[PDB]
Enzyme design. Structure first.
Site, PDB file in Angstrom:
ATOM      1  CG  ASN A  10     -41.088  28.498  20.515  1.00  0.00           C
ATOM      2  OD1 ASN A  10     -41.076  27.260  20.570  1.00  0.00           O
ATOM      3  ND2 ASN A  10     -41.812  29.166  19.622  1.00  0.00           N
ATOM      4  CE  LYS A  12     -39.580  30.017  16.662  1.00  0.00           C
ATOM      5  NZ  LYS A  12     -39.600  30.932  15.480  1.00  0.00           N
ATOM      6  CG  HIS A  94     -45.476  30.306  17.420  1.00  0.00           C
ATOM      7  ND1 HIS A  94     -44.969  30.369  16.140  1.00  0.00           N
ATOM      8  CD2 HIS A  94     -44.548  30.880  18.224  1.00  0.00           C
ATOM      9  CE1 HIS A  94     -43.769  30.921  16.172  1.00  0.00           C
ATOM     10  NE2 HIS A  94     -43.497  31.254  17.422  1.00  0.00           N
ATOM     11  CD  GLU A  96     -42.487  29.325  13.751  1.00  0.00           C
ATOM     12  OE1 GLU A  96     -42.503  28.336  14.518  1.00  0.00           O
ATOM     13  OE2 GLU A  96     -41.577  30.189  13.784  1.00  0.00           O
ATOM     14  CD  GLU A 166     -45.455  34.593  17.053  1.00  0.00           C
ATOM     15  OE1 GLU A 166     -46.612  34.113  17.150  1.00  0.00           O
ATOM     16  OE2 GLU A 166     -44.549  34.038  16.402  1.00  0.00           O
ATOM     17  N   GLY A 172     -38.527  37.371   7.130  1.00  0.00           N
ATOM     18  CA  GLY A 172     -38.242  37.054   5.740  1.00  0.00           C
ATOM     19  C   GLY A 172     -38.690  38.067   4.698  1.00  0.00           C
ATOM     20  CB  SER A 212     -35.273  38.824  15.969  1.00  0.00           C
ATOM     21  OG  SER A 212     -33.977  38.276  16.099  1.00  0.00           O
TER      22      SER A 212
END
Lengths: 249, 250
Positions: A10, A12, A94, A96, A166, A172, A212
């Site tokens: 991906n 992105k 996804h 995001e 995911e 974060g 990750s």
């Protein structure tokens, strides 16, 4: 006795001809001696350069999103437009897009149902946030996302479905996922699929890890019994991606 | 004042294939119009590469239909920087369809426009009110609220690269039929506000395009209006008759 693994890139919202051409040429040079489906997902703008230049037969090109219909939807790209261009894979739901771009469960489920209807392979993304994980809702959340998609599909469509988990809770926040934590979620996802669609569909279903992934950790992640490959972020924009594909041996 | 250079812009929206678009591109390559006009075509992101390679009529610039403000972890989106690197220098922002369905709030549109101008783009900024808003007497209220959000983030210099498109959303897919006179009413109030905020020169130079239903039948009736500087065309821009629409800016 795992199904065919998938190693998916991906990219992105990233890319340029200077960055992507050498990357594509490297992939073209890469040989694998094991059965693996590789996927690259460029931005819509870079799909044409990628299709023109990617020659490795083990690769398919995917879109990073699509809407269900052509028409008066300024800014968007439909499944039908992608199919006409020769693209037959798509990433949907996804994290995001669920967070920032209006991908609700119902919107994702309809996109998936239509992609499957049009003959696409679909990488369907699920995952829980930190608040959700800490409320003890990991299973409930990913299964709610999955069930929304599943409700629209006939049994036969599952041959073209792939799930990506995911761990959104790990971005974060200060948190970090371990392979054993990934395995726990992949396993409960597969068990639900087993309970709804039967043992064969569950066993053949690819469930990819979408946290990750690096050349450093890919081998240990692939060792987990219910992990069938990766949906890779940052490392897929680097030559190290080849070694990640290698870790699906 | 005399009108500035007109713009004839094609918004292909979420439509396209080689079989549909190539004939249109070749019709435009074969077109003979020679007056001063900036033509714009906005393909989907997927069709931008083909269009850039095939469209050779130098009176045309290619635009994106949307963009986000930065590259990064924004799966599915295309950024201004990615477009700039590809050689695209026009962008449509705040289209009514995005405000309605795809999360383009006033503030989000304003940040996109500000970034686009800073990245060297010309920007077609879209504004317009719904049927409910017009009935409520809020035509001026809505379009000035949308435009002022954008203007708050712009330097005076940025305006040289700003183009406004008015979309009469109240007349699109409703039984309402907008007249050239009603379009002129809104274009005039928009230009009056710009003149009052930024001065005579900026207002005189500003292109305000009509983005309602434009066809080869009605294009001249609209361009005759004093404050209409061209078009942002929907359905008719997917047809050869778009050439006649460009001719209407003479």
């Amino acid at each position: 006795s795992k199904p065919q693994p998938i190693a998916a890139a991906n990219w992105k919202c990233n890319g340029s001809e200077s960055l992507l051409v050498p990357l594509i040429e490297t992939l073209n040079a890469a040989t694998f001696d094991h059965d693996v489906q590789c996927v690259v997902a460029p931005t819509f703008l870079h799909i044409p350069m990628t299709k023109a230049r990617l020659t490795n037969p083990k690769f398919q090109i995917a879109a990073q999103n699509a809407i269900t219909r052509s028409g008066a939807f300024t800014g968007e790209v439909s499944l039908q437009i992608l199919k006409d261009y020769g693209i037959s894979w798509v990433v949907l739901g996804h994290s995001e897009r669920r967070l920032y771009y209006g991908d609700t469960n119902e919107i994702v489920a309809e996109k998936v149902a239509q992609a499957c209807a049009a003959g696409f392979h679909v990488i369907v993304c699920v995952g829980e946030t930190n608040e959700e994980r800490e409320a003890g809702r990991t299973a409930a959340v990913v299964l709610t996302q999955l069930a929304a998609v599943a409700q629209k599909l006939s049994k036969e469509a599952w041959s073209r479905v792939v799930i990506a988990y995911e761990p959104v809770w790990a971005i974060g926040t200060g948190k970090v996922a371990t392979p054993q934590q990934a395995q726990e979620v992949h396993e409960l996802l597969r068990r639900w699929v087993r309970s709804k669609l039967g043992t064969d569909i569950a066993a053949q279903l690819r469930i990819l890890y979408g946290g990750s992934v690096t050349a450093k950790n890919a081998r240990t992640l692939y060792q987990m019994r219910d992990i069938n490959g990766f949906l890779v972020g940052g490392a897929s924009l680097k030559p190290e991606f080849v070694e990640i594909i290698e870790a699906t041996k």
